[PDB]
Design a protein around this ligand. Structure first.
Ligand SMILES: [Zn+2]
Ligand SMILES: [Zn+2]
Lengths: 142, 338, 40, 249, 370
C-alpha cells in the first residue's frame, strides 16, 4: 500500500505529518506487525524524502526517526533484518545521513566482533541466539 | 573546588559554562566505568553520593549550566549523548538523580518559551525515555504518578503521552490501575489516556472494565472527544461483546443533548461511525438485532431511524432486512410522524 | 455615525471666537461668520 | 407550612406551569413570564411548588434553554433561588461527573446569571461532606469560564475566601488564580494568612502559583509565612518551592 | 451578615441613616470604582410597597430605560438590603452595556511610559497615533525591504492587559503578553513571524510582478490563493501553504473542456518534477511546459470578455469563468447567470451538482458543475 500511495507522500506534506503520528504511536502498539510496518513506513519516508521551514529541523527530525530506529535494532531479528536491507536504500537517497547510519551499524556489529588477534572464533555465535524454555531463536542476523 | 566538578574533571568530562555543548576528553562507557570504580573505591563510600548530588544541585541553581548538562555532549575526536543520561546509566546515583530532576521540574510551570523555543519540562522528561535499566521501576512510577496527578493541563497531557518510551515491560499493571483511577477522577484526560492504554500491556479483562467504566461516563464527555472515544470503543469491540456494547451505546447516546457548534461535531461523529461500520460487518446486523430485539418499548429514539437510513446507504445485504424491520416497527405503533 | 461613547474633539487652529454663526453654503465647503474676542 | 402566599396569577396559573414543564422533556411562554410577579420568598415556595429538582437533565437545560431567553432578568436572589432548587440536589447526588447537559446547562446558565449561579451554589456544595471529584470539576468550570469577568472572578474570590478551607477549596481556588485574577493586598493577605495554614499535594500547587504569579503582590511578611509552610518535607517539590521562594530572595 | 444592622453597613458602606428612626437614608452607592448620590425615603414603617427614591441627575441618565424595573423591584422586594443588592447589580449591567463611556488613561504611567517605550523602539517605526492615543500603527522592514504594518488598540491600562493586535499576514499571530513585556517585545515577535514567512512573501510578490494575477486584484498579505491567467479566457487558481510555500499548492483550472484536458494530463505526468528548492513560477513553467502572459491589456482591451448573459466583468466578485466547449463560440459566462438561464430551459436536466444543456450563443452542449 504505502509504496503504492507513496506519490501522495511526495506531494502532500499534511499526509506525511499525519502518517508520522500514526507510525510513532503504532511503534509501541501490542500487535507485532504494527511495529514492523511502522519501521517499514519510517524507512520509506527517509528513503523517499529529505523533508518530513528550514532544512535544519528536517535533519534533526530525520535524526530523531533514526534514534527510534536505533532502539528498534534491539527488537527481535525480523525488525532488525528489515532495517538493515533498508539502510542501503536510505544511503542511496539520503547521503547526508551516511555517518549517522554507518556508526549505527558498526556499534551493533562490535557487540558480536572481538578486536584481538590470536583468538580463532573472532565472532560469538552463542551470543546471537537466545533461548527461553526450549524455544530457541536468532537475534541480530550477522 | 566542589567534589562534583573535581570527580567529573578526573573522570574525563569537560564542564563548560552553559552556552555551548560540553566537550568530552574520554569515551562515554570508559567515563561511566571510571567514575563508577572511582566512587566505589573512594572512602566515605555511602556519603560521597549525597556530597555528589548536593554539589550537582548547587551547580544547577543557575539555569544555563543545567541546560548544557541536559543537552547532548561534544566528542572532540562529533555529537554525543547528554551527561544526565550517561550519569543516570550508573545505578547508585539513579534514584537520587530522579528525585532531584523531578523535585526541580515544578519551577518551570509558568516560565514558558524563554529563549530557543525549548520546553524545559518536555526536555527533562525526555531525559528518562529509553533507559538501559531503572534502579527502581516502581519508585519512578510513584514519582511520575504524583507528577501526572498534579501538573497543569498541557504539561499533564505531554508527560502522559510520553509514558511508553519511559516504561520497560514490568510496571505496566500498577500504571493501568492508577490511570483507570484517574479516568473515573477526571473526564478531560480520556483521549490521551485511552491512547496510552492501547499502547501499554494490559489484561483483556481490564480493557473491558475500563470500557464499561468510560461508557457509564459517556454522557459526561465534552463533544470534541466524543468522536475519538467511540472510535476507541468500536476499534476495541471484540466480535462477541458486539451486541451488549452496541445496546449500551444505543441506550446511552442521545443525538438530542449536544445542540455551527453542535452540528459539525455530530457530523464528525457520524463519519467515525460510518468508518467503523463500513469496515466491520458484524456491527450492522448486531445493531439492527439491538433495535429489533428492543421491539418492546414504543419509546425508541432519533438515533434508531438515522442509523437504519445510514446502513441502507451502506452495506446493501441488509436492505430487505431493514425494510421488514421498519414495517414491523411502523405497524406496531412505535414509529410515527413526530 | 447608537451615537457615541466619548466626545473626542479637534481644534480648527483658529483663536477664541465668541458668538459664532454658521451659513450652510452647499455651492467649495462650509463658510461661517465669527466675532473674535479682540473685536474682529 | 409557613403559609407564604404565592402571587395570585402564579397560584392560579400553577397547574399550567407544571403542564408546560412536562411539555419540555418531549420560544418561552407568557406563563413562564409570571416569575416576574414573585418576591424571592414567594419564588422560594414556588420553585418547591413546581418540583424543578425532578425535571430530566435535558428538561433542566430545556428549562434553562427557555429561562436563558427571558427578558427581563430574574433578579439576583430569584436566579440564585431557582438554580439551587433546580441543580443543587443533582450536584449533591453526584457519584460521578456530570452529563454534558448539566455542565453546559450550568455553564450556559452561569453564562447569563454568572454570579447568581456563582452566589448560590459554590459555598454550600463545598461545606457539604463527601464533596469529591464529580463536584470540584463543575466548580472548575464556574471559575474557568471565559465569561467570568474581573467583577465575577473576585466575587468567586470574595465567595471562596469565606469558606472553611480544605483540599477541595484549593483545587478550585488554584483554577481561579490560574487566570492571573487581580486582588487587593487585603484579599491576597487573607489568602496568605489562610494559605500559611500543609501536607497535601494540592496545597503545594496553590502556594507555588501565587509565589510565581503574584510575586508582584508578595511582601516580606507573606514570603516568610510561606517559608514556615514549606519547612515540612511532607511537601514534595520543596526544592522548586525553595527555588521560586529563593527567586523572590 | 444575616441581619440588616451589619449586612447593610457591609454592603452599602456609604449610606448614612439621617433620621433616628432609620427611615431617611442618604449618601452614595458604589459600582465600578464610582459613587453616585442617592436619598431613599421610606414611610413611618419599613414598607417599599410605598417608598420614594430620589437621585442625582447623573444617576437618572444611567437608569433611563429601567424606571419600570426599579418601580417593580421596590414593590416586589422584601427588605431594603436585597433592594440595594439588586440596584447595584442593575448598575453593573447598565454601565457594562454602555462600555463606550469609559477607558480614561491614568496621567502617571500612561502618556509618559508609552513615549519612553516608543523612544526605546525608534521613531522611524511609528506611522500613526490616534488623538485618543488609543490606536497606534507600527512599521517593520523585511530583509527583502518590504513594509509590513501592525495596528494596536490599547486600553486605559496598556501595561496591565494585552493590546488588541491587528496584523496583515494570513497565519494567526500569537503574542506572549506579560505586564513586563512591552512594545519592543511584541515588535520582536512580529519581526520573528516576518522573517519566518519571508519565503511566502517573496513567492507571492514574485507572482504579482512576473505573471497576470487575475482573481485577487490589489491583493492583501493574508491571501494564499492566486487565480493566474494563461493564454486567453483559461485560468489556474492556486492556494499555497504559508508554512511550506515552496511545497506544492492545491491547484485547479478553469477554462474550455477541450483546452484544460491536456493541462491536467501534463500536470499529472510532470508533478514529480515539482521541487521546493526552486520558486513557484520556476517550477510551474517547467512542470506545465509553458510561459505566462504579462497582462495582455492593450490589445484585447474591449474584446467582450464578459458573461455574454449580463455582459459584465465583475458580477459581485464573480469573474467570467465557465466557457463553451466549442471553437466557434468560446464565449465566457458566469456561474449565476448561466445557472438562471439553464434552470429554465426544457432542454436542461440536472445530475448531482451538474446541469447539462445548450450554450446561449451557439446551442451546443455545455456543462455547469455548481
Ligand atoms: Zn457556445
Ligand atoms: Zn453574468
Amino acid at each position: 500500500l504505502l509504496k503504492a500511495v507513496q506519490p501522495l507522500l511526495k506531494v502532500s506534506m499534511s499526509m506525511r505529518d499525519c502518517l508520522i503520528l500514526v507510525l510513532r504511536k503504532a511503534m509501541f502498539a501490542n500487535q507485532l506487525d504494527a511495529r514492523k510496518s511502522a519501521v517499514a513506513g519510517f524507512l520509506l519516508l527517509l528513503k523517499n524524502f529529505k523533508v518530513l521551514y528550514n532544512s535544519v529541523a528536517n535533519e534533526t527530525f530525520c535524526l530523531e526517526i533514526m534514534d527510534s530506529l536505533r532502539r528498534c535494532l534491539s527488537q527481535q531479528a525480523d525488525v532488525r533484518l528489515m532495517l538493515y536491507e533498508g539502510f542501503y536504500d536510505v544511503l542511496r537517497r539520503n547521503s547526508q545521513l551516511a555517518n549517522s547510519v554507518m556508526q549505527t551499524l558498526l556499534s551493533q556489529l562490535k557487540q558480536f566482533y572481538e578486536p584481538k588477534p590470536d583468538l580463532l572464533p573472532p565472532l560469538k555465535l552463542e551470543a546471537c541466539i537466545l533461548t527461553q524454555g526450549d524455544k530457541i531463536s536468532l537475534q541480530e542476523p550477522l | 573546588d566542589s567534589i562534583f566538578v573535581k570527580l567529573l574533571k578526573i573522570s574525563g568530562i569537560i564542564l563548560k559554562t552553559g552556552e555551548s555543548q560540553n566537550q568530552l576528553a574520554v569515551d562515554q562507557i570508559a567515563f561511566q566505568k571510571k567514575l563508577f570504580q572511582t566512587l566505589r573505591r573512594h572512602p566515605s563510600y555511602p556519603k560521597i553520593i549525597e556530597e555528589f548530588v548536593s554539589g550537582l544541585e548547587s551547580y544547577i541553581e543557575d539555569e544555563d549550566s543545567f541546560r548544557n548538562c541536559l543537552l547532548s555532549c561534544e566528542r572532540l575526536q562529533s555529537y554525543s549523548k547528554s551527561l544526565i543520561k550517561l550519569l543516570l546509566g550508573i545505578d547508585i546515583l539513579q534514584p537520587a538523580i530522579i528525585k532531584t530532576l523531578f523535585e526541580k521540574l515544578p519551577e518551570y510551570f509558568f516560565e514558558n518559551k524563554n529563549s530557543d523555543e525549548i520546553n524545559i519540562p518536555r526536555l527533562i522528561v525526555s531525559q528518562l525515555k529509553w533507559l538501559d535499566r531503572v534502579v527502581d521501576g516502581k519508585d519512578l512510577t510513584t514519582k511520575i504518578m504524583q507528577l501526572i496527578s498534579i501538573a497543569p493541563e498541557n504539561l499533564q497531557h505531554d508527560i502522559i503521552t510520553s509514558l511508553p518510551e519511559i516504561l520497560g515491560d514490568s510496571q505496566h499493571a500498577d500504571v493501568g490501575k492508577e490511570l483507570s483511577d484517574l479516568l473515573i477522577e477526571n473526564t478531560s484526560l480520556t483521549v490521551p489516556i485511552l491512547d496510552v492504554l492501547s499502547s501499554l500491556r494490559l489484561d483483556p479483562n481490564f480493557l473491558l472494565k475500563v470500557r464499561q467504566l468510560v461508557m457509564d461516563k459517556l454522557s459526561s464527555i465534552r463533544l470534541e472527544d466524543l468522536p475519538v472515544i467511540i472510535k476507541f470503543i468500536l476499534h476495541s469491540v471484540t466480535a462477541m461483546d458486539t451486541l451488549e456494547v452496541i445496546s449500551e451505546l444505543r441506550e446511552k447516546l442521545d443525538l438530542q443533548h449536544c445542540v455551527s457548534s453542535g452540528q459539525s461535531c455530530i457530523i464528525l461523529l457520524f463519519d467515525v461511525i460510518k468508518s467503523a461500520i463500513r469496515y466491520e460487518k458484524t456491527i450492522s446486523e448486531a445493531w439492527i438485532k439491538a433495535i429489533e430485539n428492543t421491539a418492546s418499548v414504543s419509546e425508541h429514539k432519533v438515533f434508531d431511524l438515522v442509523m437504519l437510513f445510514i446502513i441502507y446507504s451502506t452495506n446493501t445485504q441488509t436492505k430487505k432486512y431493514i425494510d421488514r424491520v421498519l414495517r414491523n416497527k411502523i405497524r406496531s405503533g412505535c414509529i410515527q410522524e413526530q | 455615525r447608537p451615537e457615541e461613547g466619548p466626545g473626542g474633539l479637534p481644534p480648527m487652529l483658529c483663536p477664541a471666537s465668541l458668538n459664532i454663526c454658521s451659513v450652510v453654503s452647499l455651492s467649495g465647503g462650509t463658510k461661517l461668520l465669527a466675532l473674535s474676542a479682540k473685536g474682529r | 407550612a409557613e403559609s407564604l402566599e404565592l402571587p395570585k396569577a402564579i397560584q392560579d396559573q400553577l397547574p399550567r406551569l407544571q403542564q408546560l414543564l412536562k411539555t419540555l422533556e418531549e420560544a418561552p411562554p407568557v406563563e413562564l413570564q409570571l416569575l416576574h410577579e414573585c418576591s424571592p420568598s414567594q419564588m422560594d415556595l414556588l420553585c418547591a411548588q413546581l418540583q424543578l429538582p425532578q425535571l430530566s437533565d435535558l428538561g433542566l437545560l430545556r428549562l434553562c434553554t427557555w429561562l436563558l431567553a427571558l427578558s427581563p432578568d430574574l433578579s439576583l436572589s430569584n436566579a440564585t433561588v431557582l438554580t439551587r432548587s433546580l441543580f443543587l440536589g443533582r450536584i449533591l447526588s453526584l457519584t460521578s461527573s456530570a452529563s454534558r447537559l448539566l455542565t453546559t446547562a450550568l455553564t450556559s446558565f452561569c453564562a447569563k446569571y454568572t454570579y447568581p449561579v456563582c452566589s448560590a451554589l459554590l459555598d454550600p456544595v463545598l461545606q457539604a461532606p463527601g464533596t469529591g471529584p464529580a463536584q470540584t470539576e463543575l466548580l472548575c468550570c464556574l471559575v474557568k469560564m471565559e465569561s467570568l469577568e474581573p467583577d465575577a472572578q473576585v466575587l468567586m474570590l470574595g465567595q471562596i475566601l469565606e469558606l472553611p478551607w480544605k483540599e477541595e477549596t484549593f483545587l478550585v481556588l488554584q483554577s481561579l488564580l490560574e487566570r492571573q485574577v487581580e486582588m487587593t493586598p487585603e484579599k491576597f493577605s487573607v489568602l496568605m494568612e489562610k494559605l500559611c495554614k500543609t501536607t497535601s499535594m494540592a496545597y503545594a500547587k496553590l502556594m507555588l502559583t501565587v509565589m510565581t504569579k503574584y510575586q508582584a503582590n508578595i511582601t516580606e511578611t507573606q514570603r516568610l509565612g510561606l517559608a514556615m509552610a514549606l519547612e515540612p518535607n511532607t511537601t514534595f517539590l520543596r526544592k522548586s518551592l525553595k527555588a521560586a521562594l529563593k527567586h523572590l530572595g | 451578615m444575616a441581619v440588616t444592622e451589619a449586612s447593610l453597613l457591609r454592603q452599602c458602606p456609604l449610606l448614612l441613616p439621617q433620621n433616628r428612626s432609620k427611615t431617611v437614608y442618604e449618601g452614595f452607592i458604589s459600582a465600578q470604582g464610582r459613587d453616585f448620590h442617592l436619598r431613599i425615603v421610606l414611610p413611618e414603617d419599613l414598607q417599599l410597597k410605598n417608598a420614594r427614591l430620589l437621585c442625582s441627575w447623573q444617576l437618572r441618565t444611567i437608569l433611563s430605560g429601567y424606571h419600570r424595573i426599579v418601580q417593580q423591584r421596590m414593590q416586589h422586594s422584601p427588605d431594603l438590603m436585597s433592594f440595594m443588592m439588586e440596584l447595584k447589580m442593575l448598575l453593573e449591567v447598565a454601565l457594562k452595556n454602555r462600555q463606550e463611556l469609559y477607558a480614561l488613561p491614568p496621567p502617571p504611567q500612561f502618556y509618559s511610559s508609552l513615549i519612553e517605550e516608543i523612544g526605546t523602539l525608534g521613531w522611524d517605526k511609528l506611522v500613526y497615533a490616534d488623538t485618543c492615543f488609543s490606536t497606534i500603527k507600527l512599521k517593520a522592514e523585511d530583509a527583502s525591504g518590504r513594509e509590513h504594518l501592525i495596528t494596536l488598540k490599547l486600553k486605559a491600562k496598556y501595561p496591565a492587559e494585552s493590546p488588541d493586535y491587528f496584523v496583515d499576514f494570513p497565519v494567526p499571530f500569537c503574542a506572549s503578553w506579560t505586564p513586563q513585556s512591552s512594545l519592543i517585545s511584541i515588535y520582536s515577535q512580529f519581526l520573528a513571524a516576518i522573517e519566518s514567512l519571508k519565503a511566502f512573501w517573496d513567492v507571492m510578490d514574485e507572482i504579482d510582478e512576473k505573471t497576470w494575477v487575475l482573481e485577487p486584484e490589489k491583493p492583501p498579505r493574508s491571501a494564499t490563493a492566486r487565480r493566474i491567467a494563461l493564454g486567453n479566457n483559461v485560468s489556474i487558481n492556486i492556494e499555497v501553504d504559508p508554512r511550506h510555500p515552496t511545497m506544492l499548492p492545491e491547484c485547479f483550472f478553469l477554462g474550455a473542456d477541450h483546452v484544460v484536458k491536456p493541462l491536467g494530463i501534463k500536470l499529472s505526468r510532470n508533478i514529480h518534477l515539482w521541487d521546493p528548492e526552486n520558486s513557484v513560477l520556476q517550477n510551474l513553467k517547467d512542470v506545465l511546459e509553458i510561459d505566462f502572459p504579462a497582462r495582455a491589456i492593450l490589445e484585447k482591451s474591449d474584446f467582450t470578455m464578459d458573461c455574454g448573459i449580463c455582459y459584465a466583468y465583475q458580477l459581485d466578485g464573480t469573474i467570467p469563468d465557465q466557457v463553451c466547449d466549442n471553437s466557434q463560440c468560446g464565449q465566457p459566462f458566469h456561474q449565476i447567470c448561466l445557472y438562471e438561464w439553464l434552470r429554465g430551459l426544457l432542454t436542461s436536466r440536472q445530475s448531482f451538482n451538474i446541469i447539462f444543456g445548450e450554450c446561449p450563443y451557439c446551442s451546443k452542449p455545455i456543462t455547469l458543475k455548481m
